[PDB]
């Protein structure tokens, strides 16, 4: 039997409104020894119930068993510790597996949009990019809007570890050439632990 | 006691100064079955010997056996199979590996660059960019220059699935906000597959 200790969504732990939940899966449980047992210590203190739920699923040829502990915003963001520690007969010593957000020193990404190149006007649909530079922990959410209306055609890069030891990223909107013509304004959303209100807004325009 | 394949660097194989290769990597060797018998056939055939080279490291608590096979970039390039064979008393089977170059038939990068915002005038330091958009497959090298010298401060993104089914990657040069200013030329040089000399370079400058 393997344990896999799952981290909240960024979203989540820096949305007030949401709800971050540490999650403890268990594959290769067994038919013959399917009792898992779970225990789950925020920081130090077993945190016991807190509001702990399991429950089993017949998969494979084996079980598989999920504990989900939810987790306390300001806990997650001030780093503490998440551990699950999982007994199961089969197993000989119990699996601990032990969590929280990158170690270190929370900085303010710097988010800059860059509008098309010429070129790029040539073609029939065009790329809007905003630069998300200079952040730490890598935790980030970024989203795209054209209004109260939230768009599609966007991709973004995994964060790229910069030579600062801090952290980038780029985001690509994908729009035809027409609407940024039509003088719409695109904005970039990006949401960080080190942000003002946990958000910032960059805007774009022809 | 498994074995990964490694394929060539995309540099190497788009160079034909350059020899790359394709390593064959067999970890987690232990003691007292350390004879490790690679197998080296190309495509259909077995190339023996052709310039295939292993050697033992003694590592963890465990051995480290790694070989390496120089590759004709026509052959990677036409795609063909690269299979390592490996051998070792202990393990019962022997471990058939293959690997090769992606199917699908390739896209020509679009290499457009992007100059500093604004809004990072205002930093000691500004950030240039390439947006290399609409190629295929993954396997492409940017690197970046100033004039007949290469610069060291840049950063690059990997390669990110679009919708098109095709990749993009973004490439970051950090540069000082003078000689940006100073007005000199920077060059972004992406080499692929897919491209007129297995190259292009898109300038920049102030
Ligand atoms: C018997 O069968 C079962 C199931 O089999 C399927 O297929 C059969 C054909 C079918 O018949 C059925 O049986 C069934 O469909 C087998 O189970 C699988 O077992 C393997 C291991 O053998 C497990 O592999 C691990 O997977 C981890 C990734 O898991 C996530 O992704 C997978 C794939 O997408 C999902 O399946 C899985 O559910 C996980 O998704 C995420 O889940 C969480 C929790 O649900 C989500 O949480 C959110 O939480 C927020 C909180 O606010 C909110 O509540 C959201 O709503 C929640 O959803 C989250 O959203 C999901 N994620 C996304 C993106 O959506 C791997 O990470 C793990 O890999 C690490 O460990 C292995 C082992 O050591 C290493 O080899 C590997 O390299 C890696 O190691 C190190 O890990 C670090 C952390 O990842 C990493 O940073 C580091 O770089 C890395 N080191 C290196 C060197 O790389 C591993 O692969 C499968 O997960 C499991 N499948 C399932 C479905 O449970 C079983 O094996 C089989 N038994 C046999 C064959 O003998
Ligand atoms: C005992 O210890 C050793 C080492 O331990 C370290 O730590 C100790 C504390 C210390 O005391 C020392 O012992 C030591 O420092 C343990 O060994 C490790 O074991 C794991 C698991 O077996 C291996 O994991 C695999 O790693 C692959 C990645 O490997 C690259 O990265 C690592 C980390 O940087 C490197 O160390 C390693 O060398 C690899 O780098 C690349 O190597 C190649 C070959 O050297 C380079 O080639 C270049 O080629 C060009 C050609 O022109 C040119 O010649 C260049 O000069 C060459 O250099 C290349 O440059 C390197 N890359 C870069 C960027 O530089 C993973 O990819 C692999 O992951 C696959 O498998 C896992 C497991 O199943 C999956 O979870 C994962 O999803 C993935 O699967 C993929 O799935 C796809 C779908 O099925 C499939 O299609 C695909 O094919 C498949 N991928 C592959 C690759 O098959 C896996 O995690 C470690 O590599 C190994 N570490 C070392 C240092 O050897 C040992 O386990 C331990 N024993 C125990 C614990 O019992």
Redesign the pocket.
């Given at each position: 039997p393997?344990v896999?200790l799952?981290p909240?969504?960024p979203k989540?732990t820096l949305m007030i409104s949401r709800?971050?939940?540490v999650?403890c899966?268990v594959?290769?449980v067994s038919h013959e020894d399917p009792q898992v047992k779970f225990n789950w210590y925020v920081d130090g203190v077993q945190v016991h119930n807190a509001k702990t739920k399991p429950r089993e699923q017949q998969?494979?040829?084996?079980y598989?068993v999920?504990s989900v502990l939810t987790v306390l915003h300001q806990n997650w963001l001030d780093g503490k510790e998440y551990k699950c520690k999982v007994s199961n007969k089969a197993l000989p010593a119990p699996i601990e597996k032990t969590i929280s957000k990158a170690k270190g020193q929370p900085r303010e990404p710097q988010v800059y949009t860059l509008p098309p190149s010429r070129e790029e006007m040539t073609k029939n649909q065009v790329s809007l990019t905003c630069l998300v530079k200079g952040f730490y922990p890598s935790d980030i959410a970024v989203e795209w809007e054209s209004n109260g209306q939230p768009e599609n055609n966007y991709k973004t890069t995994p964060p790229v570890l910069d030579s600062d030891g801090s952290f980038f990223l780029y985001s690509k909107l994908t729009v035809d050439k027409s609407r940024w013509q039509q003088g719409n304004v695109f904005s970039c959303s990006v949401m960080h632990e080190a942000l003002h209100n946990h958000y910032t807004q960059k805007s774009l325009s022809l």
């Open positions: 393997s896999f799952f909240p969504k989540d709800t971050p939940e999650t899966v594959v290769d998969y494979n040829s084996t598989r999920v």
